């Protein structure tokens, strides 16, 4: 029954996601707000602790005790350079414990500090949750991703996470390799499978290169840019409209924070429409000062405003192949992963500089690693018997 099942998690950096392998099918477990990822936020309020959904909705009213970006935390050291520049850019306090970080925040009126893992234990707990409500037993056993270049100290952290949260951890695997194992790219039979998974998320690039010879899976390279993602392209559409309202109202709206975050939020659902549509409606009633901003913008001028951040995605392509020692034509798979790799543009790019090659995107990529994850926990916990 419930030792019979084990789930698969994709602890992500700015959103987690939860499968389940039964029936033979991959079932992406829907949150109880509906959605296939949950925000890897943890909010302490007045009266209580909220994960997910719930805790990202009211991250502009209670910034200094929304915690996010906990994986840029697990496993290090808090004299790591990582650490001390990242802090620089977060509203939430950051403490040393014996040269270990904790994230100090304000709960039910009382100071309260916590190690990344159990902060990253507290999203796990909602996965957990998440898939126990849809199975309708509790579910125990589970499969948990990190990235390709997480060190030992950073795949024991994540391990604690899991334990803390009331999981058995069947195993930490690579997130490029749960990738590789949704598409059924370790089951070709024999002879080397050269593939690239390409991962563009909400924070993070990640380009990984593996070889896959007879199930055995090598990570040849990685390279990517920690600080780019979804959210620089959600800024570069702030900026086009605040300069905008600028123009149409002669007021500057930069300085109220309300205008600001209400703008960022309409800008990440146009840039979502703007990957199936050619055009997307901003529709905010009184932004600032009463005046109600409608307009739209065109898939082309998006495509100018994040012209150099795309073009930026090949350097760590060609980086990555210089050093797994690759030619293009020597990769035999292209695999997507994370929701920004759905912009039409991204895939072109990446397409043109394959020579015009087909890419593995028919699973949501934002939910790729987590099919994995689950189809990998199936296979171990159907060992362990
Ligand atoms: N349809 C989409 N078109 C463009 N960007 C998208 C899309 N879906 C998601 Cl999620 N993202 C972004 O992916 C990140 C999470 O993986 C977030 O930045 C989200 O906006």
Known sequence: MAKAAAIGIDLGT?????????????????????????????????????????????????????????????????????????????????????????????????????????????????????????????????????????????????????????????????????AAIAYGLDRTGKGERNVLIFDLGGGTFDVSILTIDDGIFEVKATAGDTHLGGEDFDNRLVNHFVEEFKRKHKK??????????????????????????????????????????????????????????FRSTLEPVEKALRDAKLDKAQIHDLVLVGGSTRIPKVQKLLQDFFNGRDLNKSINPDEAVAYGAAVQAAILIKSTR
């Open 252 to 309: 500057d709206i930069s300085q109220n924070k309300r205008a600001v975050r209400r703008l960022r939020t309409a800008c990440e659902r146009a840039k979502r429409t703007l990957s199936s549509s050619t055009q997307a409606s901003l529709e905010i009633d009184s932004l600032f000062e009463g005046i109600d901003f409608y307009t739209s913008i065109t898939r082309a001028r998006f495509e100018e405003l994040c012209s150099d951040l």
């Open 14 to 178: 700015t959103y987690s996601c939860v499968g389940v392998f039964q029936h033979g099918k991959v079932e992406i477990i829907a949150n109880d707000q509906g959605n296939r990822t949950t925000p890897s936020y943890v909010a302490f309020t007045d009266t209580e602790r909220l994960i997910g959904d719930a805790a990202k909705n009211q991250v502009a009213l209670n910034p200094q005790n929304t915690v996010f970006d906990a994986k840029r935390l697990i496993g290090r050291k808090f004299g790591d350079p990582v650490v001390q520049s990242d802090m620089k850019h977060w509203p939430f306090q950051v403490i040393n414990d014996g040269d270990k970080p904790k994230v100090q925040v304000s709960y039910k009126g009382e100071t309260k500090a916590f190690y990344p893992e159990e902060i990253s234990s507290m999203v796990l707990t909602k996965m957990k949750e998440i898939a126990e409500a849809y199975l309708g037993y509790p579910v125990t056993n589970a499969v948990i991703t990190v990235p390709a270049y997480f060190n030992d100290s950073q795949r024991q952290a994540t391990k604690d996470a899991g334990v803390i949260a009331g999981l058995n951890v069947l195993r930490i695997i690579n997130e490029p390799t749960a």
